[PDB]
Protein backbone atom coordinates (compact mmCIF):
# COMPACT_ATOMS: atom_id res chain seq x y z
CA UNK A 1 0.00 0.00 0.00
CA UNK A 2 2.90 2.39 0.68
CA UNK A 3 5.55 1.15 -1.74
CA UNK A 4 7.29 -2.15 -2.34
CA UNK A 5 8.95 -3.63 0.74
CA UNK A 6 8.31 -3.14 4.42
CA UNK A 7 7.02 0.42 4.78
CA UNK A 8 9.06 2.76 6.96
CA UNK A 9 7.64 6.22 6.21
CA UNK A 10 6.39 8.34 3.32
CA UNK A 11 6.84 11.96 2.26
CA UNK A 12 4.30 13.89 0.15
CA UNK A 13 5.27 16.28 -2.62
CA UNK A 14 2.78 18.49 -4.42
CA UNK A 15 2.42 18.22 -8.18
CA UNK A 16 0.05 19.92 -10.64
CA UNK A 17 -3.39 18.28 -10.33
CA UNK A 18 -1.96 15.53 -8.14
CA UNK A 19 0.34 14.32 -5.39
CA UNK A 20 3.62 12.40 -5.42
CA UNK A 21 4.45 10.11 -2.51
CA UNK A 22 8.09 9.22 -1.82
CA UNK A 23 7.75 5.86 -0.07
CA UNK A 24 10.69 4.75 2.09
CA UNK A 25 10.83 0.98 2.52
CA UNK A 26 13.14 -1.60 4.08
CA UNK A 27 14.24 -4.28 1.61
CA UNK A 28 16.20 -7.33 2.84
CA UNK A 29 19.36 -7.59 0.77
CA UNK A 30 21.84 -10.48 1.08
CA UNK A 31 20.29 -13.77 2.26
CA UNK A 32 22.25 -16.87 3.32
CA UNK A 33 20.98 -20.44 3.64
CA UNK A 34 20.72 -22.04 7.06
CA UNK A 35 19.50 -25.29 8.50
CA UNK A 36 16.50 -24.65 10.75
CA UNK A 37 14.33 -26.54 13.24
CA UNK A 38 10.86 -25.91 14.68
CA UNK A 39 11.86 -26.61 18.29
CA UNK A 40 14.76 -27.66 20.52
CA UNK A 41 14.81 -30.65 22.85
CA UNK A 42 17.00 -30.05 25.90
CA UNK A 43 15.82 -32.00 28.99
CA UNK A 44 12.85 -33.89 27.62
CA UNK A 45 11.13 -30.54 27.09
CA UNK A 46 10.39 -28.80 23.81
CA UNK A 47 11.66 -25.22 23.48
CA UNK A 48 10.34 -22.60 21.06
CA UNK A 49 11.75 -19.15 20.19
CA UNK A 50 10.10 -16.24 21.98
CA UNK A 51 10.65 -13.88 19.03
CA UNK A 52 13.03 -15.43 16.49
CA UNK A 53 13.86 -18.66 14.67
CA UNK A 54 16.37 -21.43 15.32
CA UNK A 55 19.20 -21.58 12.77
CA UNK A 56 22.25 -23.80 12.41
CA UNK A 57 25.49 -22.59 10.85
CA UNK A 58 26.32 -26.26 10.23
CA UNK A 59 27.55 -27.29 13.67
CA UNK A 60 26.08 -24.80 16.16
CA UNK A 61 22.48 -23.77 16.79
CA UNK A 62 21.45 -20.15 17.36
CA UNK A 63 18.28 -18.09 17.59
CA UNK A 64 18.02 -14.99 15.41
CA UNK A 65 15.44 -12.36 14.61
CA UNK A 66 13.57 -13.30 11.47
CA UNK A 67 14.34 -10.33 9.19
CA UNK A 68 18.04 -9.75 9.95
CA UNK A 69 20.68 -12.37 10.70
CA UNK A 70 21.83 -11.77 14.29
CA UNK A 71 22.69 -15.16 15.81
CA UNK A 72 22.36 -15.44 19.59
CA UNK A 73 23.02 -18.22 22.08
CA UNK A 74 19.91 -20.27 22.82
CA UNK A 75 18.96 -19.57 26.44
CA UNK A 76 15.89 -19.75 28.66
CA UNK A 77 15.40 -16.00 28.24
CA UNK A 78 15.37 -16.63 24.48
CA UNK A 79 12.80 -19.44 24.52
CA UNK A 80 9.69 -20.80 26.21
CA UNK A 81 8.91 -24.42 27.10
CA UNK A 82 5.79 -26.34 26.07
CA UNK A 83 5.37 -30.10 26.35
CA UNK A 84 7.83 -32.94 25.94
CA UNK A 85 9.84 -33.87 22.83
CA UNK A 86 7.41 -36.38 21.32
CA UNK A 87 4.80 -34.38 19.34
CA UNK A 88 6.81 -31.78 17.40
CA UNK A 89 7.88 -32.94 13.94
CA UNK A 90 11.49 -31.96 13.28
CA UNK A 91 12.66 -31.23 16.83
CA UNK A 92 16.43 -31.44 17.31
CA UNK A 93 18.45 -31.88 20.48
CA UNK A 94 20.69 -29.04 21.61
CA UNK A 95 21.57 -27.48 24.94
CA UNK A 96 19.51 -24.54 26.18
CA UNK A 97 21.76 -22.38 28.34
CA UNK A 98 20.59 -21.33 31.80
CA UNK A 99 21.95 -17.87 32.73
CA UNK A 100 21.42 -18.43 36.46
CA UNK A 101 23.46 -21.65 36.67
CA UNK A 102 26.90 -19.93 36.63
CA UNK A 103 25.66 -17.34 39.14
CA UNK A 104 24.57 -20.08 41.53
CA UNK A 105 27.91 -21.81 40.91
CA UNK A 106 29.78 -18.53 41.51
Amino acid sequence: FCGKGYHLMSFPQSAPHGVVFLHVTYVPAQEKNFTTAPAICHDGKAHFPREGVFVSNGTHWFVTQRNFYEPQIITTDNTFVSGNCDVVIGIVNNTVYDPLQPELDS
Binding site: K4, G5, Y6, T25, V27, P28, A29, E31, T36, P38, A39, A46, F48, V53, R66, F80, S82, G83, V87, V88, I89, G90
Partner: protein, 99 residues
Protein backbone atom coordinates in the same frame (compact mmCIF):
# COMPACT_ATOMS: atom_id res chain seq x y z
CA UNK B 1 -25.32 -17.65 -39.55
CA UNK B 2 -28.96 -17.37 -38.43
CA UNK B 3 -28.43 -19.86 -35.59
CA UNK B 4 -25.60 -17.62 -34.28
CA UNK B 5 -26.05 -14.08 -32.96
CA UNK B 6 -22.30 -13.48 -33.27
CA UNK B 7 -22.64 -13.54 -37.06
CA UNK B 8 -25.27 -10.78 -37.03
CA UNK B 9 -23.08 -8.75 -34.66
CA UNK B 10 -20.06 -9.16 -36.94
CA UNK B 11 -22.10 -8.34 -40.06
CA UNK B 12 -23.23 -5.09 -38.43
CA UNK B 13 -19.75 -3.93 -37.41
CA UNK B 14 -19.66 -5.16 -33.79
CA UNK B 15 -16.63 -7.23 -32.80
CA UNK B 16 -15.04 -8.71 -29.68
CA UNK B 17 -11.29 -8.26 -29.16
CA UNK B 18 -9.14 -10.90 -27.44
CA UNK B 19 -7.38 -10.11 -24.15
CA UNK B 20 -3.67 -9.37 -24.26
CA UNK B 21 -2.90 -12.02 -21.66
CA UNK B 22 -3.98 -15.52 -22.64
CA UNK B 23 -5.55 -17.88 -20.12
CA UNK B 24 -2.29 -19.84 -20.07
CA UNK B 25 -0.33 -16.72 -19.08
CA UNK B 26 -2.81 -15.87 -16.31
CA UNK B 27 -2.51 -19.44 -15.02
CA UNK B 28 1.28 -19.02 -15.13
CA UNK B 29 0.94 -15.89 -12.99
CA UNK B 30 -1.32 -17.64 -10.48
CA UNK B 31 1.04 -20.61 -10.22
CA UNK B 32 4.00 -18.27 -9.68
CA UNK B 33 2.09 -16.53 -6.88
CA UNK B 34 1.11 -19.87 -5.34
CA UNK B 35 4.68 -21.21 -5.46
CA UNK B 36 6.00 -18.03 -3.89
CA UNK B 37 3.44 -18.21 -1.09
CA UNK B 38 3.87 -21.89 -0.23
CA UNK B 39 7.67 -21.85 -0.39
CA UNK B 40 8.56 -18.43 1.07
CA UNK B 41 5.50 -17.10 2.89
CA UNK B 42 5.27 -13.33 2.62
CA UNK B 43 8.98 -12.74 1.93
CA UNK B 44 8.66 -12.72 -1.87
CA UNK B 45 6.22 -9.80 -1.64
CA UNK B 46 8.86 -7.57 -0.03
CA UNK B 47 12.08 -8.73 -1.70
CA UNK B 48 13.73 -11.95 -2.76
CA UNK B 49 11.81 -15.13 -1.99
CA UNK B 50 13.30 -16.55 1.22
CA UNK B 51 12.53 -20.25 1.56
CA UNK B 52 11.13 -21.54 4.85
CA UNK B 53 9.57 -24.90 5.81
CA UNK B 54 5.80 -24.68 5.51
CA UNK B 55 5.05 -25.75 9.09
CA UNK B 56 7.31 -22.97 10.37
CA UNK B 57 5.53 -20.47 8.12
CA UNK B 58 2.23 -21.67 9.59
CA UNK B 59 3.71 -21.08 13.05
CA UNK B 60 4.53 -17.52 11.95
CA UNK B 61 0.90 -17.05 10.86
CA UNK B 62 -0.41 -18.43 14.16
CA UNK B 63 1.81 -15.89 15.91
CA UNK B 64 0.31 -13.31 13.55
CA UNK B 65 -3.17 -13.97 14.96
CA UNK B 66 -2.03 -14.04 18.59
CA UNK B 67 -1.75 -17.82 19.05
CA UNK B 68 1.53 -19.26 20.32
CA UNK B 69 3.38 -21.41 17.81
CA UNK B 70 3.39 -24.51 20.03
CA UNK B 71 -0.36 -24.67 19.35
CA UNK B 72 0.48 -25.04 15.65
CA UNK B 73 3.27 -27.57 16.20
CA UNK B 74 1.38 -29.78 18.67
CA UNK B 75 -1.75 -29.91 16.46
CA UNK B 76 0.08 -29.89 13.12
CA UNK B 77 -1.49 -33.07 11.73
CA UNK B 78 -4.96 -32.03 12.92
CA UNK B 79 -4.52 -28.62 11.28
CA UNK B 80 -3.23 -30.11 8.02
CA UNK B 81 -6.12 -32.59 7.94
CA UNK B 82 -8.66 -29.82 8.53
CA UNK B 83 -7.14 -27.83 5.67
CA UNK B 84 -7.20 -30.87 3.38
CA UNK B 85 -10.86 -31.53 4.22
CA UNK B 86 -11.78 -27.89 3.58
CA UNK B 87 -10.05 -27.97 0.19
CA UNK B 88 -11.93 -31.18 -0.59
CA UNK B 89 -15.20 -29.44 0.26
CA UNK B 90 -14.30 -26.59 -2.09
CA UNK B 91 -13.72 -29.22 -4.78
CA UNK B 92 -17.01 -31.04 -4.17
CA UNK B 93 -19.01 -27.81 -4.07
CA UNK B 94 -17.52 -26.73 -7.39
CA UNK B 95 -18.27 -30.16 -8.89
CA UNK B 96 -21.89 -29.94 -7.67
CA UNK B 97 -23.01 -26.30 -8.03
CA UNK B 98 -23.12 -25.06 -11.63
CA UNK B 99 -23.90 -21.38 -10.87
Amino acid sequence: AARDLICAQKFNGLTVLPPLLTDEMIAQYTSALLAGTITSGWTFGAGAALQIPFAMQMAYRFNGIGVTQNVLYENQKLIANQFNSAIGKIQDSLSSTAS
